[PDB]
Amino acid sequence: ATYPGATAKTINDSVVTLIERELSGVKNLLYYSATTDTSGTAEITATF
């Protein structure tokens, strides 16, 4: 998920939490992670 310019706090509180609220309860979800960096980009990796 891209959101240009915006620092990691914004991506973390406005984008990642939203997507993570739906990632749960997915079939065979082993574990899940989400990293937001300073490039205005968040990588949410759902590992099955």
Partner 1 sequence: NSPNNQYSEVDLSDYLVRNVVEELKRVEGVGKVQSFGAEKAMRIWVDP
Binding site for partner 1 (CB under 8 A): 17, 20-22, 24-25
Nearest distance, CB of residue 18 and partner 1, angstroms: 9
Identify which of residues 35 and 39 has a Cβ nearer to partner 1 in the complex: 35
CB of 24 to partner 1, least distance (A): 6
CA 42 to chain centre: 5
Cβ 26 to partner 1 shortest distance, Å: 10
Question: Side chain identity at 39, as an amino acid letter?
Answer: S
Residues whose CB is less than 8 angstroms from the CB of residue 12 and which lie 6 or more positions away in sequence, other chains included:
36, 42
User: What is residue 46's DSSP assignment?
Assistant: E
